Design a binder for this molecule. Structure first.
Ligand SMILES: N[C@@H](Cc1ccc(O)cc1)C(=O)O
Ligand SMILES: N[C@@H](Cc1ccccc1)C(=O)O
Ligand SMILES: N[C@@H](Cc1ccccc1)C(=O)O
Ligand SMILES: [Cl-]
Ligand SMILES: [Cl-]
Ligand SMILES: [Cl-]
Ligand SMILES: [Mn+2]
Ligand SMILES: [Mn+2]
Lengths: 452, 448
């Protein structure tokens, strides 16, 4: 049961982009998939002619909005599934993740009293890194459906290069739908916030959030009363699989009218903690592409390394071109983040300081499932805000993993999801996502932090 | 040469009973693949993100209702036969562009809004009059069914092309959306290409006036202080259109069935049996639908389409597409217009000046004579002016490439030129210049 694509039988790069790109891919790359270099090459030839998932004008537009975030004048909300599955690439799932992001954005916008840039982990998040190459059941590790199968069989965990095309096909389908949803009635702010006032009515913790959901309702009605009457959701994934990102590269006149290389698998991509080798091919790939890029910074980050990233990835001091995504865990952020900020801020580069309160607070549960505690996530964002407020720098955004489904993958929250509940609805293919109820809860709380 | 791509919430029972009964009618021109495999691929397509959403169809239904009511013009165009291997960024990009160029021109001459409908994101299947072609092979019936390659294997009907077709359709509709919401939207840009057309083109002097007159309205627009492209294909492979059915509510309040593989679909000359499955399928879906009408159309039968496909007198919901041939449109059409108008139904009279003017070229290729296309639209207008009806739109076959599939126009493509760039996998298309030329000419027909 399978379909079949023909292998073809694009214009040459200017010599410098040819060289820098070939130079960049020559360098070592962690966590890449093992599969025949000639099969991967067949895939990349398919992917080199397909209609792009994004287009350059949209990436330039995001670069401009992200510059406003960098400069303290807007706020970045990045969210979505931890790992996208070809299995769940369905309208109800996409719609509920779009809805979830749009809801959090209204709340965050009112809290920040400034615009929120919405970026979804969607339309390409089909690949993850693995600390160990053999998993709990002695099997080859699952690396995301761009690589192998979540199914726990020896045959499913084989790295299949055809999943490159299967990943693009799913990606541009989900993107088509995202485009359609965000230009439909789903985007209307008044519609989107009624979903939030529903949440307050039906939630156990409605009381904690009702005053604010009502303040927002009055802000929206205030708009209408003044004579006002859409949405932009950008695509992002971790750029982990260089074969994929290579194929999706397209050449176009850029911010300066000279030809640049845009990675059109998404609008923005981030290198993760296990792949940010400073002299590696990931970081060097990031130096050839025009896209906004981000870098995960965990607890072993030094102010001086952080600065080297800033000087390599933001060579031209383009505010908002580089995002630095902090994930230290709550007990470490207040101590570790300030020195990094002070030294980076001192260079004169305007980075976006994005908080990631998820990948620093995971812990195996007493049930066998890997989970995260709501109260620890809150604490790190809070701690992240405390540190930026102390320094006078901009808390530029968050980076959360969520679904529009009432899964039970994270503890606590309004539902006091306990360790014996994490088995009732553990849908995720990788890390524990906050269900929709905990998504909005956090958005409300982060909105409170944004206020004064 | 190829690679295998692996694979791995029902509708209400009262709508399936209705639907299963409608689809029990006889369907022409259908694939001959095993129903169990078809059923597997359908179950796949039953769960994928839709190519369109109901709010866009309800929205199109609103815009088309104004075409019927006389206050807007329908521009429908694109490739004759989409192929998976030409479904590329440049090709999509130049068909979007060409279609935007024609719409600016037509909007000015019509002095009213122009709905833009592309043949794209699903136009992967054609009927065939003979199931053995001139190579003595099973005929090519579109990439949704089999392969353009001459050989027994390629020509076998492959139901996994249902999925490959949807994939190509999504990827292309995702790009059209990106394109229409970026710089390509901008009129002053789209028309600056129209003025490259006039600079380069040989007939430049024939169109320099109107091109300048428009550039001045655009500057006037700007001085005074001051895009949607819909998708459509012929609904042919019914395993596809029915797997792409989704349930939501529209202009009613009750939940309707939409076919979310496109925004509007039409039923071809060879599938419109009043009691066949295709007409019965259009009955059931909420999408705007069109029906092709050739020379052997009784004024009586046009009316039975109107009663069967516009049962609730919704203007624009039904379009009737003239495809008579220039030599026949002026005489064969008027009685059809009359008989339908007198029924109290508002429909879109749309002109297809191509699918009935295809003449074999002395050099082997099937082609079309520019002067005969232009002349059928012209005669199509002369009818409607004479009858006081609304010339509702054109349905046209174009590409953004400089192919040489049609005869005449600016470049004066001749019997021997057809071999230069005959790139269509089916009918011959007006190249970029001829699409624009025709656009200017139809603007003058619309002129006050
Ligand atoms: N896709 C090519 C690079 C490339 C990109 C765009 C081009 O126009 C040309 C070449 C690679 O992976 O090496
Ligand atoms: N059009 C090519 C490549 C493609 C694959 C998947 C989706 C879109 C395009 C094919 O069908 O083989
Ligand atoms: N998600 C399914 C269906 C699908 C096919 C092709 C494109 C998009 C979705 C798959 O991976 O096959
Ligand atoms: Cl662009
Ligand atoms: Cl038949
Ligand atoms: Cl084919
Ligand atoms: Mn994760
Ligand atoms: Mn045709």
């Amino acid at each position: 049961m399978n379909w079949t694509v023909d292998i073809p039988i694009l214009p040459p790069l200017p010599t410098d982009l040819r060289t820098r790109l070939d130079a960049a891919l020559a360098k070592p790359a962690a966590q890449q998939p093992t599969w025949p270099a000639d099969q991967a090459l067949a895939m990349r030839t398919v992917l080199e002619s397909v209609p792009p998932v994004t287009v350059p004008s949209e990436i330039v537009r995001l670069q401009e909005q992200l510059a406003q975030v960098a400069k303290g004048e807007a706020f970045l909300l990045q969210g979505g599934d931890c790992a996208e599955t070809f299995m769940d690439n369905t309208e109800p799932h996409i719609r509920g993740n779009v809805r979830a992001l749009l809801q959090m954005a209204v709340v965050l916008t009112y809290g920040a009293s400034m615009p929120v840039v919405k970026v979804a982990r969607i339309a390409g998040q089909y690949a993850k890194p693995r600390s160990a190459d053999i998993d709990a059941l002695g099997l080859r590790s699952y690396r995301g459906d761009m690589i192998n199968g979540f199914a726990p069989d020896a045959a499913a965990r084989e790295h299949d290069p055809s999943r490159l095309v299967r990943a693009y096909a799913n990606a541009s389908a989900a993107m088509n739908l995202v485009r359609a949803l965000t230009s439909s009635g789903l985007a209307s702010l008044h519609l989107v916030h009624d979903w939030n006032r529903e949440f307050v009515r039906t939630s156990p913790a409605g009381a904690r959030y009702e005053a604010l959901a009502t303040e927002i309702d009055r802000g929206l009605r205030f708009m209408s009363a003044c004579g006002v009457a859409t949405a932009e959701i950008y695509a992002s994934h971790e750029a982990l699989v260089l074969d994929y990102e290579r194929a999706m590269l397209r050449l176009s006149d850029g911010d300066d009218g000279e030809p640049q290389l845009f990675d059109l698998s998404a609008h923005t991509v981030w290198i993760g903690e296990r792949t940010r080798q400073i002299d590696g091919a990931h970081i060097a790939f990031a130096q050839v592409i025009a896209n906004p890029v981000g870098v995960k910074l965990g607890p072993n980050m030094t102010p001086e390394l952080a600065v080297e990233y800033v000087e390599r990835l933001d060579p031209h001091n383009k505010p908002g071109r580089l995002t630095l995504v902090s994930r230290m865990g709550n007990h470490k952020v207040r101590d570790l983040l300030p020195p990094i900020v002070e030294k980076v801020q001192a260079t004169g580069h305007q980075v976006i300081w994005q908080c990631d309160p998820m990948h620093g607070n995971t812990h195996e549960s007493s049930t066998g499932f890997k989970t995260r505690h709501f109260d620890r996530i809150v604490d790190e964002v809070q701690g992240f805000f405390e540190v930026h407020r102390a320094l006078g720098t901009h808390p530029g955004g968050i980076h959360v993993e969520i679904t529009g489904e009432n899964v039970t993958e994270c503890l606590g929250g309004a539902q006091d999801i306990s360790e014996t509940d994490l088995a009732g609805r553990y849908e995720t293919a990788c890390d524990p996502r906050l269900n929709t109820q905990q998504s909005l809860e956090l958005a409300f709380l982060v909105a409170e932090m944004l206020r004064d």
